[PDB]
């Protein structure tokens, strides 16, 4: 069904986060809180892990629960990509202009609220 | 319908602008205004958010409102992509040739006018 398209989208997004994270110049003088680096690593690794898990589960085929899990994986891949962009711009610009990073964060909060509201809806309705 | 193609192209362009924002090298002695960096961050994050919202709407599939919202999301993704390209060329060239960046702005002005007028038209007819 839609599993092929969703898996393709998640694979593309994961590959985009990976090619991003590999080509990131860092420095020992960086001012980012180490929590930012920890969250960057966690977000990228979780995105690629979820994409691979979705691909494996889709191509390896209670059952409608697994389909709902597939949809949840797609939505979580989307949200993780959004948070990846947030953390990426943060760790990119925090040494130059903290206001740029904080403005990017504050303007991405409402769309994250909308996404998490849909996710919380589907989790309150998660079987 | 045309939802899958829109999702594919919007995700591609969003990630494209993301890795572009990844490979921008600046310095603490730059001449770019801080407002330019703020606009860079806001525009990139908004483009990513709009593309992700379009992807989630495609995954969602009274229906006419949803179709119009999907088309409007694709249009706004195009708007933000063009504006992002303008900002990126500006920040890339302003350190050497301010006239180059200004020329890039004045050469993306007319198509921006065309798309804004097209956006107002559909938005006016959107409910």
């Amino acid at each position, epitope marked *: 069904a839609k599993l092929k398209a969703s898996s393709k989208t998640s694979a593309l997004l994961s590959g985009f986060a990976m090619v991003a994270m590999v080509e990131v110049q860092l420095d020992h003088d960086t001012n980012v809180p180490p929590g930012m680096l920890i969250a960057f690593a966690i977000c990228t690794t979780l995105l690629v892990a979820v994409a691979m898990l979705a691909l494996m589960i889709s191509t390896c085929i209670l059952h409608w629960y697994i389909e709902t899990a597939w949809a949840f994986s797609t939505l979580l891949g989307l949200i993780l990509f959004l948070l990846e962009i947030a953390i990426l711009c943060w760790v990119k610009f925090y040494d130059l202009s903290p*206001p740029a990073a904080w403005s990017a964060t504050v303007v991405l909060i409402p769309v994250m609220i909308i996404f998490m509201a849909f996710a919380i809806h589907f989790y309150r309705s998660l079987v | 319908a045309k939802l899958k193609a829109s999702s594919k192209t919007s995700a591609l362009l969003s990630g494209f602008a993301m890795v572009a924002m990844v490979e921008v090298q600046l310095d603490h002695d730059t001449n770019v205004p801080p407002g330019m960096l703020i606009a860079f961050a806001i525009c990139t994050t908004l483009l990513v958010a709009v593309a992700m919202l379009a992807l989630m709407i495609s995954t969602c599939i009274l229906h006419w409102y949803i179709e119009t919202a999907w088309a409007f999301s694709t249009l706004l993704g195009l708007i933000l992509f063009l504006l992002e390209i303008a900002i990126l060329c500006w920040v890339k060239f302003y350190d050497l040739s301010p006239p180059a960046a200004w020329s890039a702005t004045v050469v993306l002005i007319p198509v921006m006018i065309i798309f804004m007028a097209f956006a107002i038209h559909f938005y006016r007819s959107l409910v």
Partner: antibody
Amino acid sequence: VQLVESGGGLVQPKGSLKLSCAASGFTFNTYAMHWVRQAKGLEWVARIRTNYATYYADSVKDRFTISRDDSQSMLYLQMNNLKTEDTAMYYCVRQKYGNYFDYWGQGTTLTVSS
Amino acid sequence: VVMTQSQKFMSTSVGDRVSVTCKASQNVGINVAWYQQKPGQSPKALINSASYRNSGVPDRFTGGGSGTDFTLTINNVQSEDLAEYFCQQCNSYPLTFGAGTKLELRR
């Protein structure tokens, strides 16, 4: 990051003196530098964009001159025709894209009397 | 651009919130920095861009405002934080500093 500067102490009016600031702990060639004086009312003195632009305060645009030795990693300021009203401490600081200083130096007393 | 200072000696007890002000003259936006000078040392950078604290700064210092008026405030003011505080516009050379106000004590 560590900035230590050492100019002279007591000089005479209408004299001259060159202060030097040593920077260690960052890429000198990528940071604009400033000299800021304090007689408790802190007042700005000069700035150099390490092209090599220089900007000077509203008073001493005729008597002070900045120079940057990127290889030697030093920031020099030569002051000429000093007055009895230039007695102050001189911090060398660095600016990071906000025109705001973050890593102030240590200080250097420059008393100009007779 | 010139920056005024309302009161030079903020007579304040311990642990109580204090508000130091800085009424700039022109429209300077949010390009204001705040520095703290303990008596006899090189002043350190407390606040940049008038809102964001620096890296190694305790979080009793919150600075706000925009345009022409700015204000730093310290809830739960310590005792070792008796020092002087300067505000500086970061917008247009020459970069000027406020007259500076100390952080006094009442006992």
